[PDB]
From a paper:
Cellular Src kinase (c-Src) is one of the most representative members of the Src-family kinases (SFKs), a group of non­receptor tyrosine kinases that mediate responses to extracellular stimuli, phosphorylating a broad range of downstream substrates. Although v-Src shares 95% sequence identity with c-Src, this kinase shows uncontrollable activity that is responsible for the occurrence of sarcoma in chickens.
In this way, in order to stabilize the domain and to be able to crystallize the protein, we introduced a Gln128Arg mutation in the distal loop (v-Src [name] [name]; c-Src [name] R95W-T96I-D117N-L124V-[name]). The v-Src [name] [name] mutant was stable enough to allow biophysical studies and to be crystallized. Even with this stabilizing mutation, the protein was still very prone to aggregation, forming amyloid-like aggregates. The resulting crystals belonged to the monoclinic space group P21, with only one [name] molecule of the monomer form in the asymmetric unit. The type of β-turn in the RT loop is also different from that found in v-Src [name] N117D-V124L. In this case, residues Ile96–Asp99 form a type IV β-turn with a hydrogen bond between Ile96 N and the Asp99 side chain. Asn117 interacts with Ser134 in the 310-helix, and a hydrogen bond between Asn112 and Gly81 also reduces the flexibility of the amino-terminal region. In c-Src [name] the amino-terminal region is usually disordered, but in v-Src [name] [name] residues Gly81–Leu89 form an extended β1 strand. In addition to the low solvent content, in v-Src [name] [name] a PEG molecule and a sulfate ion facilitate the packing between protein molecules in the crystal.
Author numbering: 81 to 140
Amino acid sequence: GGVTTFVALYDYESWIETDLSFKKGERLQIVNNTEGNWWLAHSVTTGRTGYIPSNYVAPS
């Protein structure tokens, strides 16, 4: 629901077109949701926005 800043725990490479790539340690602003583990995220590093798998991140 809200926005929180998360940190990536592992590298991740976009491969479903709508997902966002990131590197371990990268900070992501994320809107969590309860429908599943794909969350809409925004990289403060790259400026890009897209879905991430929530098991790859943790709150900062």
